[PDB]
Amino acid sequence: LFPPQIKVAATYMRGGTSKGVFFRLQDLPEAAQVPGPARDALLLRVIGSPDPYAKQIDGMGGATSSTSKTVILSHSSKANHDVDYLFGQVSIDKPFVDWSGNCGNLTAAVGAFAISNGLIDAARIPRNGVCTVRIWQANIGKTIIAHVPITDGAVQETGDFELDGVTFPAAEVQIEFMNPAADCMFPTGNLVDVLEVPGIGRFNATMINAGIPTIFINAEDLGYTGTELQDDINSDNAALAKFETIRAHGALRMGLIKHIDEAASRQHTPKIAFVAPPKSYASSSGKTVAAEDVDLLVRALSMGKLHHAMMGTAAVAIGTAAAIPGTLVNLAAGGGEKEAVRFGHPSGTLRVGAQAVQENGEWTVIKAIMSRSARVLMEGFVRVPKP
Amino acid sequence: LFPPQIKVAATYMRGGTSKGVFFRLQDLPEAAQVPGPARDALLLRVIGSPDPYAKQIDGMGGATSSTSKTVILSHSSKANHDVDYLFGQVSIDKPFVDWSGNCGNLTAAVGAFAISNGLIDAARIPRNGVCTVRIWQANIGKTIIAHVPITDGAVQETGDFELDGVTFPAAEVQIEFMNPAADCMFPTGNLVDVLEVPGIGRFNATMINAGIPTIFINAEDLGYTGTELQDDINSDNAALAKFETIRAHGALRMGLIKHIDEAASRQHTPKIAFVAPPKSYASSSGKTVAAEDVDLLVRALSMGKLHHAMMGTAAVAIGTAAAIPGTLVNLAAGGGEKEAVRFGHPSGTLRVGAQAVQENGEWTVIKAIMSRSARVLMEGFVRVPKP
Ligand SMILES: [Ca+2]
Ligand SMILES: [Ca+2]
Ligand SMILES: [Ca+2]
Ligand SMILES: [Ca+2]
Numbered sequence A, B: 001l002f003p004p005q006i007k008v009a010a011t012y013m014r015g016g017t018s019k020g021v022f023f024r025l026q027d028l029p030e031a032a033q034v035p036g037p038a039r040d041a042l043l044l045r046v047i048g049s050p051d052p053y054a055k056q057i058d059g060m061g062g063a064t065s066s067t068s069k070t071v072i073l074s075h076s077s078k079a080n081h082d083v084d085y086l087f088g089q090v091s092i093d094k095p096f097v098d099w100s101g102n103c104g105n106l107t108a109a110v111g112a113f114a115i116s117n118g119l120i121d122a123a124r125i126p127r128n129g130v131c132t133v134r135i136w137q138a139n140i141g142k143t144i145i146a147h148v149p150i151t152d153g154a155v156q157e158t159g160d161f162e163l164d165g166v167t168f169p170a171a172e173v174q175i176e177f178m179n180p181a182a183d184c185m186f187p188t189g190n191l192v193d194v195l196e197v198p199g200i201g202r203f204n205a206t207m208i209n210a211g212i213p214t215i216f217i218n219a220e221d222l223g224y225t226g227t228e229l230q231d232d233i234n235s236d237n238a239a240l241a242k243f244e245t246i247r248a249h250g251a252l253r254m255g256l257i258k259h260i261d262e263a264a265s266r267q268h269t270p271k272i273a274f275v276a277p278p279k280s281y282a283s284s285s286g287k288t289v290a291a292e293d294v295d296l297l298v299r300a301l302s303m304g305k306l307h308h309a310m311m312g313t314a315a316v317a318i319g320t321a322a323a324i325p326g327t328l329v330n331l332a333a334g335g336g337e338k339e340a341v342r343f344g345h346p347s348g349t350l351r352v353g354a355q356a357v358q359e360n361g362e363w364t365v366i367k368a369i370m371s372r373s374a375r376v377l378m379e380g381f382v383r384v385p386k387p
Helices: A037-047 A107-116 A237-253 A260-264 A312-322 A328-332 B037-047 B107-116 B237-253 B260-265 B312-323 B328-332
Strands: A006-015 A018-024 A069-075 A083-090 A129-137 A142-151 A173-178 A193-197 A201-210 A212-218 A271-276 A296-302 A340-345 A348-359 A362-372 A374-384 B006-015 B018-024 B069-075 B083-090 B129-137 B142-151 B173-178 B193-197 B201-210 B212-218 B271-276 B296-302 B340-345 B348-353 B356-359 B362-365 B367-372 B374-384
Touching (some): A006 A037, A006 A107, A018 A107, A037 A069, A037 A083, A037 A374, A083 A107, A107 A129, A107 A173, A107 A374, A201 A237, A201 A312, A201 A328, A212 A237, A212 A312, A212 A328, A237 A260, A237 A271, A271 A328, A312 A340, A312 A348, A312 A362, A374 B006, B006 B037, B006 B107, B018 B037, B018 B107, B037 B069, B069 B107, B083 B107, B107 B129, B107 B142, B107 B173, B107 B374, B193 B237, B201 B237, B201 B328, B212 B237, B212 B312, B212 B328, B237 B260, B237 B271, B296 B328, B312 B328, B312 B348, B312 B362, B312 B367
Parallel strands (some): A018 A069, A083 A129, A212 A271, B018 B069, B083 B129, B212 B271, B296 B340
Antiparallel strands (some): A006 A018, A069 A083, A129 A142, A142 A173, A173 A362, A193 A201, A201 A212, A271 A296, A340 A348, A348 A362, A374 B374, B006 B018, B006 B374, B129 B142, B142 B173, B173 B367, B193 B201, B271 B296, B340 B348, B348 B367, B356 B362
8 A cells, every 4th residue: 555645835936046845834844843864854754865876867856966855844942033934954865864954055945935824914025116025934933034025915936136046037035144143153162273183284273153153264375276076076075084084173162062073973063164365266157256356265165065156054154253353264355344245156156244242342143144045946745655 | 228038928837867958839929929939039048048058057947958958849740639739959069959750758848838838628637647648749749648647636846756767756757659650661771771971980870760860880880888978978079079970971871960060950860879789887876787787878969978877768769679580689688579678777677668569561669658656846937038
């Protein structure tokens, strides 16, 4: 006996440079309406994981970190919030869904999905204009604001706003990551540190907890320039192994793990990235990024490979770190106080703003801001074999 | 000033080791219900192409040949057929949909889709048992038969049938490719030819038109063992170019194209593949394929890269060629008469049957047979901006 597949109401969306499968909590099977193995098993099967072929041909996944993602949204019980946002990074190779972080790219899609699916107080949705969606990011306990355009009572998806890494234009969605610093911003208590990896090297690093726990290293310390593309790194097993050990040692120094061996099973956080001063390069689309077009270069890894553009959470970490004089990110951008930076990633450029202000002689960051876009790709029902 | 996206009823399915977006003809926007610019533009946009980033983040595509596919199905008005099947291979990088060939992997999905969407006379569907779907493959003008299991009047999707390259088991769907040889099996009139490839060299090749036009060369004559996985070839841009030049010159030699430059925008057909005698190797999943487990090894390229498993149409070409004594495929399997072969591809093994009969010095093949599986991944509506 092999019962028919179940059907679960879902929407497949692009948010920024990421793709995800979005669910209303109430649309999930009863067993999956709370965190736990039942929920994880459903999401794993929807995506096509675990997959020893690493192709996700038997699911909704695209076999990359940017395309192996799930989102569960529900009404909020938090004061001054409209929607609760839970994000699951679905492992391609392991039966594991990681709930330890946010997805900054899908935030624009979160706002749109909430409006389109009855998760926002109707009084907050104008007939035309802007719907300000106040998102409670339930993974990290942070407020994120999405300013979603509205036309004729519906989300305005289409438009002429272009973002590097996104093939086609769409409507601009402004996002505000409120109070991004973990609440410490710098867990080591230092703006810069030296990560000692005995027998491998010594590496200047800034370790910051804002957007997502992130370790920034200088490109030159790795023999890189910061202009590298995926093909320069992602077939280099030695380089990948090196990034992973530095990430592990950074995780230990940040107090995110107690023993170095824990890093193997904790792949999603912290992120590791490398920075450099402005330099001209051809992006992955063949478009020239001039040194004059950027304040710095940043490349980041996700789930053990160089990311094709930039993770939204990592973009928050870049903006926040750039606003603090003396961080490796700030110094790559020429030092001094900074309200915003435009950085060069493999697919082009991204501008992120972060207002740092002194209070009691210490830096505080009110918010980090960026613009993304989002659109529905498919809507209806996903199917999996009966649980 | 920017109209909403349109909704198009569609089903996203896995068929064999491929994923595709399936449409009823009548569900398409009127402009796309005939061949031409409007249809190709729509399918490109659904998939997320052309994409200079080569990631298909802004569409249904998975940025690989196995995952950049569209299918248009309708009830057949042709005598002795149930469903008209039109397959479009959507280019990742170019504004092109290739209509020159079939997709053998998606054939099982075509049968299931036809049953589930009223494209076959209900009187032909048993309440419980197997529904024999007669498919008119409209790209190549051939009959293909799909034997789809039925439970309680609906397609039985789930089951315990396992196929190398498919993550999870599903219901077995037996497929029959009727009279696979082109209306000639060997367009050159020879079982093995010397293919002259200007700027590269000359190669012994079997060029066969069955399932899909295919050029077969010995692994050793290209400097390979036949045990190669994707990482051994797909980052070797010199090797890839060499393959493409040979593929182009083979296309010309087979009379598929009139001029060598036509191969640039005819990428789906012909295919190029290399063969070897049985050898042990670890598959892409880490599973050992023992030499005793197979009759030969075959690796094939699709759209310029080594394929992750095997194309279904190339599997037909392999089975058919193996059945004709003296082809490079037959010789790789040790020669003599063969009614079926199991070959090793990067993902494991696949068995194909194709009995050949000799009369008056000529071999004919009534049918090529293999088993696949299919399942619905998502159903509902895809969205694209208003055309
Ligand atoms: Ca990628
Ligand atoms: Ca293919
Ligand atoms: Ca129709
Ligand atoms: Ca592939």
